[PDB]
Nucleic acid binder design. Structure first.
Ligand SMILES: [K+]
Ligand SMILES: [K+]
Ligand SMILES: [K+]
Ligand SMILES: [Mg+2]
Ligand SMILES: [Mg+2]
Ligand SMILES: [Mg+2]
Ligand SMILES: [Mg+2]
Ligand SMILES: [Mg+2]
Ligand SMILES: [Mg+2]
Ligand SMILES: [Mg+2]
Ligand SMILES: [Mg+2]
Ligand SMILES: [Mg+2]
Lengths: 208, 61, 271, 178, 137, 139, 101
RNA sequence: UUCCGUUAACGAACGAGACCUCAGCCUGCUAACUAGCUAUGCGGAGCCCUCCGCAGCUAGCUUCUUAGAGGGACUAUC
RNA sequence: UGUAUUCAACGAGUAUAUAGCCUUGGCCGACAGGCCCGGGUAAUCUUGGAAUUUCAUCGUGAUGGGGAUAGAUCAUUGCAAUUGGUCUUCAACGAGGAAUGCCUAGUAAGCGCGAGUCAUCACUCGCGUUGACUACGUCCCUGCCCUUUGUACACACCG
C-alpha cells in the first residue's frame, strides 16, 4: 500500500490541480475556491462561485463530478461535487480579481473599473482595500499604479490571515496586465466575515 | 616604578578609541593626582604600574 | 510583646502559617516560594502555594497552590495523601470542616467549593479567604461585602455590606460566635454571627492581611501595613527593602506567643 | 587544603611580588583554585569576567593554536600536566610558583600608539604575557626534535635568555623611544 | 570477592585475554595472517605479527558486552577514516571475510552460537571463562 | 531511599538511580574509577573529592548516560551525581545537611547545581558555518 | 474482546486534539477501558528551494516546513461499538483509520 | 518616527513594535504494549551480594523519551 | 602509521513483478563484489547507530607528512564507460609579495552525519561533536542615518 507521506503529497498536488483546472473553466462564473472532505465512503468536493445560477446550468455539475471520478481514477459512487454561492462576493479577493479582469476586458476604462471594484469592496464592509495594476496601459512604457485606502497592514504573522489577496495576469490586446487585489478583514468572533481572532494591536476594554 | 591606582575613567579616546584616559594617584603619595592613558581594559579601583611618573596628559585626549 | 527570634530559611513570601490544635511542634508554613516547610519540605505542586492548614489530629498538612488545585499531605512521609482538582481559577484559601472531614476552598472563580476528604461527592456554591465557624461559613467577596452561608443545604444565610474597601480575609471567634473583616479602608468591622448585624468598628488604617482572634485572651490581632495592631474585646490598641509588609498572623494555642509570616522569610515570634 | 591541582599541587604557598597584578590572577588559596584547568564555564559574557578564571585555565586555553589544534583542550591540559611535572621535578619547587614567576616576568609595561608612548592594562599585561609564552613555545616546537611539553617547560623556567623576554625587550625598546 | 569484565579496564583485559588465547593453543589460523589488510581504507597491514589473537580477544569482549550483532555489524565497528587523497576524508568499513572466519572459529570453540534474533550470542562456558580470567586480574 | 536524578549537558543525560547500601558507585554498569579518559576522570570525582566519601558511605549510586559527546557525558554525570546527593538528604535524611552540601557545592562552582543552557544554534543559509559566511570577491 | 486500534492523522493540532478528546470521552460513555491517548511523535517534512526563477542575484533560499501530527487509541471492545462511536461527525483535516489489534 | 515632553498644530494611516516558529526551565498536570524507569519471579556466572537476559495482558510509575494543554520574565524588589 | 576504550542529532527508506527503496542475518569472496533467509509502506526493521582517548614503530631527513601523475589489474552502475577494490609510480609543496574575505559565544575554528543532486558519480541546505583568544570601544578607514551650511550639479561629483 501507499505510505502516509506520499499520500499527503498526492492529495496536496491533487487539490492544486483541481484548483487550477476549475479556475481556468469558470471564468464566465467566477470560481472562488473549493472545499474537499473525506467522509466514510464519500469524497465531497464542493466548488464555490460568485455566480451560482450559471454553474448549475444541474447536468453540467454531474459531468464535472464524473470528471474527478474518471480522470483521477476515483471510485464511482464515492465522489460528489456540487456548486455553492459566495457568502460575500466583495470580501473575496479572487472574486474581485476576475471581476476587474472581466470589467477591463469588456471595454470599460481600467481606472473606472478599479474605482467600481473599490466601492464594491467597501460595500461589502472591508476594513481596507488595495488594487495595484502594473504594465502598459496606453503607452509603450510600463507603469505601476495603485489605489489603496482603509486599514492596510504589511508585515508579520497577521498578514497571512487578516488579509485576502489575489493576483491575475489578464491577457489584453497589447500584452499582459498584472492585477493584484488585497482586502483587509475585520475581527468577526463568529468567523463568517474574516478571521476568528482579534489583531495584536486591537484590544477591547470592559467598562468598569 | 611608581605604582598608581586608577581613580576615575575619562572615556575611551584615540583614533580607534583603543586608548583609555584615566586619572591616578600614587600609592606612595596619595595626595598627588596625575592624568595618564592606558591600553586594554581598565576599571576603577585597579592598581597600575609605570616607568616614568613625570609625563602629563590632557582631558579628553 | 517582645522579640523571640528571627528566621531566614525562606526565599520568597510565606503566605500561611498553620499550627496544630494539639500545640505540637509540627507547624506547617505554606509559601508562594513554590515550597512549604515544617517546623520537612514539600514541593509536590508546581506553582505558588497560598493557604495551608493542619488537620485536627495534627499529623497531616493541607495546602492549596495558585495553579488551581489543593493537596492534603502526609506530613511524615512528605507525600500527597490526596489531591483536589477542579478549581479552574487560582485558589485563594482553604479550611477544614467542623469535624475536619470536609474541605472548603475559595478561589478566583467567584465561587466556593466543598470537597470530601475521602468521598467523591463535591459541591460548589473573587472570594477571599474563608474560615468556617467552629455551623455557618463566612467568606469575603469582591464587592466589599462579607457573605455568610448555611451548611444545612449549601444556601446563603445573609450578607454584611458596611465595608468601605475590599475584604481580603475573614475572622471567626474560637467558639464560632463572632465575625470580623478588614481591607484597604483600614477599619475592621466586627459583627455577631447569630443576628448577622453590625456590632462595631475598630480603626487600623490600611490593609490587614490576617485577622486572628485570641483563643484565650478574647483579643484581635491585625497585620496592618502601617503597624500591627492588637485590640481587646475596649476597642483600643493597648507592632513594628524600603517596603515593609507582613503577610499573615497566627495565634499560638498557648496564647502567650504569636507567629508572623513575612515577605522575605523573616518569620517572627512574639511573646 | 582539601583542593589540590591534580591532587598533587598545593596552592597555599604561591604569592605575587606585586600589588598591581593580584586580582587578575586566580592564585589565591581561598577560592578560584581548581582541580584542573578544564571547565565549561562562560567567561566572555561580561567585562573583566576572565579575571576570576584560574591562571592555569588561561595558560591551557592559549595553546590551542594554530587552526589544526583548536577544539583539543584535552591535549592542552595533558601537555600542561607534563610540563608541570617537568618543572616541579627539575626545579624542586611548586610549579604554580614557576608559572606565576614566568607570567609576572613576561608582561610588557608600555607601548606606543597613535606615535606616543603610554602604559598597558594589567589584564592586557597578563594576556599578552600568556600569548607570548604560547607563541614562543609553538615557535620552538615547530620542525624540531622537541615535543610541546619540553619547550613549554624551558620557556617557563627561562622566563621566571628567552623568546618572551626578548619580545618584551624589543616592544619596550620601541615604546621607550617615543 | 570477584572482579568482572566491568571491573577491569578494556585495554589490559583485551591484552591479557589475547595472551590467554595465545597459550590456549586450540583455535586455528588462516594462511593469510600477515598479508591481508583488516580494512581497505588501511594502507599498511597490522604490523603486529599476532594481530589475529588481539582481534579475536576484541571479539570475545564485544560479544560479552552486546549480543545479536551480525557480520555487517562487526564490519561496521572496525571501520574508520578513509582519506581519498586531495578529496575530503570519509567513513569506511573493515574486512568481512576475515571477520566471518574468526566468528566461525569462535563458534568452533563454543564461545558463541547462532541466534533466531540475528547475529551471535555468547555461550555460558565462554562468558564463564571471561569471568574467571577477569577474576584472575 | 531510591530517587531519580537527571544530569543534562548539551545533549547528554546521566540518569542516576539511588539505593541504600555500602556506597557502591557505578556508571553504565561500570565502576566510577574506570572513567575514560582517565585524565578527565578528576572532573567526575569532584563531588566525591569535595563533599567526601563519609557523606555517601551508606548509599550506592548507579548512573546510565546517553547522548551527547564524551565531554558532554562527563559533565552530565558531574552534575547528575551532585543532584542525586542533594536528593539524598532532601527527601530521606533532613534539611540542614542537604542545605549545607548544596551551599558548599554552589560556592565551589555554580554548574554543579545549575544546568548550563548553552545549545548549538541553527546554521543560517548563505554561509558555511552557523554564523560565518563565504569569501566575498567583488571582481 | 477483539481489541481495536484507531489512528488519527492530521496536520492541525487543534482539530486532532479536540477530536481525540471527543472520541475518548465517547468511548468512556460506554464504560470502556481506553489506553491513551498516545501522542505519536510528530514528523516534519523540510524542503528548501531557491526563490529566483533564474539564478541571477544573491542566492536566497526559502525553507518550507510541514508538520504531521498523529494520535493512536487502543480500545478493548468489540469492533461494532468502535464503529458506532466513530460514526459521529468529523472536522476537516483529520483522517481516521481502524485496524484489528 | 520607541517613548516622555516641547509645540501652529490636531487627529490619524503604514513601517518598527506588536505577531508566528524553534530552542532554553518545570521531580506541576494530561498518558503512553510502535517509548521508557524500578522492584520482584525465572534462567547466567562468581544464600546474600556483584551481575546479563527473559516474562509477569497492570508489579507499580511517567522522575528518565515522546506531545499537548499550561506556567515561568514583567525589569519587580536593592 | 599500526593496535585497543567508545559518546550524537537531523532526515530518509519499497510497484513485490524472485526483486526497483532502507536494508537485518547466514554463507562465499583478501578487498571490491555475489547467493540464501527475510523485516519495514514505518517511534516497530535499517537505527544494536569521527576528530578525541591508553599503547608502540617512526626521529626532524622533502621522511612512513604529502600523493599530484602514470601503468598493470577486478568488479559494480548504466542498453551502451561513471565510479569503486590490489600493487607498483611517488610531482609541486619546508606557512606563501602587493592585495584580500569571515567572525564576539557553545560563537570562530576542527571533525563527521543526513538530504537535494542520482541508472552511476559530492557543491548547496540542515544536523551533531570538541571547543577557545581578544573585544564589549570608536567613527580613524569603508559606509549608513539625521541637523546646520555651501553650490554655477539636477543624466544630480563617474557632475
Ligand atoms: K574501528
Ligand atoms: K536474579
Ligand atoms: K604520490
Ligand atoms: Mg503594525
Ligand atoms: Mg515585527
Ligand atoms: Mg517525565
Ligand atoms: Mg513565558
Ligand atoms: Mg591514532
Ligand atoms: Mg554517542
Ligand atoms: Mg610524508
Ligand atoms: Mg607526497
Ligand atoms: Mg552543483
Amino acid at each position: 500500500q501507499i505510505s502516509k507521506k506520499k499520500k499527503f503529497v498526492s492529495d496536496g498536488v491533487f487539490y492544486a490541480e483541481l484548483n487550477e483546472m476549475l479556475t481556468r473553466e469558470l471564468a464566465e462564473d467566477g470560481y472562488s475556491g473549493v472545499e474537499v472532505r473525506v467522509t466514510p465512503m464519500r469524497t465531497e468536493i464542493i466548488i464555490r462561485a460568485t455566480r451560482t445560477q450559471n454553474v448549475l446550468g444541474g447536468r453540467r455539475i454531474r459531468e464535472l463530478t464524473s470528471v474527478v471520478q474518471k480522470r483521477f481514477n476515483f471510485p464511482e459512487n464515492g465522489v460528489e461535487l456540487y456548486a455553492e454561492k459566495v457568502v460575500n462576493r466583495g470580501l473575496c479577493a479572487i472574486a474581485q480579481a476576475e471581476s476587474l479582469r472581466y470589467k477591463l476586458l469588456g471595454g470599460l476604462a481600467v481606472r473606472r473599473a478599479c474605482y467600481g471594484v473599490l466601492r464594491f469592496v467597501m460595500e461589502s464592509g472591508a476594513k481596507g482595500c488595495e488594487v495595484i495594476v502594473s504594465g502598459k496601459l496606453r503607452a509603450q512604457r510600463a507603469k505601476s499604479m495603485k489605489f489603496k485606502d482603509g486599514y492596510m497592514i504589511s508585515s508579520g504573522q497577521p498578514v497571512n490571515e487578516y488579509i485576502d489577496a489575489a493576483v491575475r495576469h489578464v491577457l489584453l490586446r497589447q500584452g499582459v496586465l498584472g492585477i493584484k487585489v488585497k482586502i483587509m478583514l475585520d475581527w468577526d468572533p463568529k468567523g463568517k466575515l474574516g478571521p476568528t481572532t482579534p489583531l495584536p494591536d486591537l484590544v477591547t476594554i470592559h467598562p468598569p | 616604578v611608581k605604582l598608581a591606582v586608577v581613580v576615575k575613567v575619562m572615556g575611551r579616546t584615540g583614533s580607534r578609541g583603543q586608548v583609555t584616559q584615566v586619572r591616578v594617584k600614587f600609592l606612595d603619595d596619595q595626595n598627588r593626582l596625575i592624568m595618564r592613558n592606558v591600553k586594554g581594559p581598565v576599571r576603577e579601583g585597579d592598581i597600575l604600574t609605570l616607568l616614568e611618573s613625570e609625563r602629563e596628559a590632557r582631558r579628553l585626549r | 510583646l517582645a522579640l523571640v527570634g528571627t528566621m531566614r530559611g525562606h526565599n520568597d513570601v510565606v503566605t500561611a502559617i498553620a499550627a496544630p490544635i494539639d500545640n505540637s511542634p509540627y507547624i506547617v508554613s505554606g509559601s508562594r516560594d513554590k515550597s512549604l516547610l515544617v517546623w520537612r519540605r514539600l514541593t509536590g505542586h508546581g506553582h505558588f502555594v497560598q493557604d495551608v492548614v493542619i488537620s485536627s489530629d495534627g499529623q497531616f498538612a493541607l495546602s492549596g497552590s495558585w495553579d488551581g488545585e489543593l493537596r492534603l499531605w502526609d506530613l511524615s512521609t512528605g507525600l500527597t495523601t490526596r489531591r483536589f482538582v477542579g478549581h479552574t481559577k487560582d485558589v485563594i484559601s482553604v479550611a477544614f470542616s467542623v469535624d475536619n472531614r470536609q474541605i472548603v476552598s475559595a478561589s478566583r472563580d467567584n465561587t466556593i467549593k466543598l470537597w470530601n476528604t475521602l468521598g467523591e461527592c463535591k459541591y460548589t456554591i473573587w472570594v477571599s479567604c474563608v474560615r468556617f465557624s467552629p455551623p455557618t461559613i463566612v467568606s469575603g467577596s469582591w464587592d466589599k461585602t462579607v457573605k455568610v452561608w448555611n451548611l444545612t443545604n449549601c444556601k446563603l444565610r445573609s450578607t454584611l455590606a458596611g465595608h468601605g474597601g475590599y475584604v481580603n480575609a475573614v475572622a471567626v471567634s474560637p467558639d464560632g460566635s463572632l465575625c470580623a473583616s478588614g481591607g484597604k479602608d483600614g477599619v475592621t468591622l466586627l459583627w455577631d454571627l447569630s443576628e448577622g448585624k453590625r456590632l462595631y468598628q475598630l480603626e487600623a488604617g490600611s490593609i490587614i492581611h490576617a485577622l486572628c482572634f485570641s483563643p484565650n485572651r478574647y483579643w484581635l490581632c491585625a497585620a496592618t501595613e502601617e503597624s500591627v495592631k492588637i485590640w481587646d474585646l475596649s476597642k483600643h490598641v493597648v507592632l513594628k527593602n524600603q517596603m515593609l509588609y507582613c503577610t499573615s498572623l497566627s495565634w499560638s494555642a498557648d496564647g502567650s506567643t504569636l507567629y508572623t509570616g513575612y515577605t522575605d522569610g523573616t518569620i517572627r515570634v512574639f511573646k | 587544603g582539601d583542593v589540590k591541582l591534580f591532587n598533587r599541587w598545593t596552592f597555599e604557598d604561591v604569592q605575587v611580588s606585586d600589588i598591581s597584578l593580584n586580582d587578575y590572577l586566580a592564585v589565591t588559596s581561598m577560592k578560584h583554585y581548581t582541580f584542573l584547568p578544564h571547565s565549561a564555564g562562560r567567561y566572555s559574557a561580561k567585562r573583566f569576567r576572565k579575571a576570576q578564571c584560574p591562571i592555569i585555565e588561561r595558560l591551557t586555553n592559549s595553546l590551542m593554536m594554530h587552526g589544526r589544534n583548536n577544539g583539543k583542550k584535552i591535549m592542552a591540559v595533558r601537555i600542561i600536566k607534563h610540563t608541570m611535572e617537568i618543572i616541579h621535578l627539575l626545579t624542586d619547587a611548586n610549579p604554580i610558583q614557576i608559572i606565576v614567576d614566568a607570567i609576572i616576568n613576561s608582561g610588557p609595561r608600555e607601548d606606543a600608539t597613535r606615535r606616543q608612548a603610554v602604559d598597558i592594562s594589567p589584564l592586557r599585561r597578563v594576556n599578552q604575557a600568556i600569548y607570548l609564552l604560547t607563541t614562543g613555545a609553538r615557535e620552538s616546537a615547530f620542525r624540531n626534535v622537541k615535543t610541546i611539553a619540553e619547550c613549554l617547560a624551558d620557556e617557563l623556567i627561562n622566563a621566571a635568555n628567552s623568546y618572551a623576554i626578548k619580545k618584551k625587550d624589543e616592544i619596550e625598546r620601541v615604546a621607550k623611544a617615543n | 570477592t570477584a572482579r568482572t569484565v566491568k571491573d577491569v579496564n578494556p585495554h589490559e583485559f583485551v591484552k591479557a585475554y589475547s595472551a590467554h588465547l595465545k597459550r590456549s593453543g586450540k583455535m586455528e589460523l588462516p594462511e593469510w595472517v600477515d598479508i591481508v589488510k583488516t580494512a581497505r581504507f588501511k594502507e599498511l597491514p597490522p604490523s603486529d605479527a599476532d594481530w589475529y589473537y588481539i582481534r579475536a580477544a576484541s571479539m570475545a569482549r564485544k560479544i560479552y558486552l552486546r549480543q545479536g550483532i551480525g557480520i555487517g555489524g562487526f564490519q561496521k565497528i572496525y571501520g574508520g577514516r578513509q582519506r581519498n587523497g586531495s578529496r575530503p576524508p570519509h567513513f569506511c568499513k573493515s574486512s568481512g571475510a576475515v571477520s566471518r572466519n574468526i566468528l566461525q572459529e569462535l563458534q568452533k570453540m563454543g564461545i558463541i552460537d547462532v541466534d533466531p534474533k540475528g547475529g551471535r550470542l555468547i555461550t555460558s562456558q565462554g562468558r564463564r571463562d571471561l569471568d574467571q580470567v577477569a577474576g584472575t586480574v | 531511599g531510591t530517587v531519580q536524578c537527571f544530569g543534562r549537558k548539551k545533549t547528554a543525560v546521566a540518569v542516576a538511580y539511588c539505593k541504600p547500601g555500602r556506597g557502591l558507585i557505578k556508571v553504565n554498569g561500570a565502576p566510577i574509577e574506570l572513567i575514560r579518559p582517565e585524565m578527565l576522570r578528576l572532573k567526575a570525582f569532584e563531588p566525591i573529592l569535595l563533599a567526601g566519601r563519609s557523606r555517601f558511605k551508606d548509599i550506592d549510586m548507579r548512573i546510565r548516560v546517553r547522548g551527547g559527546g564524551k565531554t558532554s557525558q562527563i559533565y552530565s554525570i558531574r552534575q547528575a551525581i551532585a543532584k542525586s546527593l542533594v536528593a539524598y538528604y532532601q527527601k530521606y535524611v533532613d534539611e540542614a545537611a542537604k542545605k549545607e552540601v548544596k551551599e558548599i557545592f554552589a560556592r565551589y562552582d555554580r554548574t554543579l547545581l545549575v544546568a548550563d543552557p548553552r545549545r548549538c544554534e541553527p546554521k543560517k543559509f548563505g554561509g558555511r558555518g552557523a554564523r560565518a559566511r563565504f569569501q566575498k570577491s567583488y571582481r | 474482546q477483539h481489541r481495536i486500534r484507531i489512528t488519527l492523522s492530521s496536520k492541525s493540532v487543534k482539530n486532532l486534539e479536540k477530536v481525540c478528546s471527543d472520541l475518548v470521552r465517547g468511548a468512556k460513555d460506554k464504560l470502556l477501558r481506553v489506553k491513551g491517548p498516545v501522542r505519536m511523535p510528530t514528523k516534519v517534512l523540510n524542503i528548501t528551494t531557491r526563490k529566483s526563477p533564474c539564478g541571477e542575484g544573491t542566492n536566497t533560499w526559502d525553507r518550507f516546513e510541514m508538520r504531521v501530527h498523529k494520535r493512536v487509541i487502543d480500545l478493548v471492545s468489540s469492533p461494532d461499538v468502535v464503529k458506532q462511536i466513530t460514526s459521529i461527525t468529523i472536522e476537516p483535516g483529520v483522517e481516521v483509520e481502524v485496524t484489528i489489534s
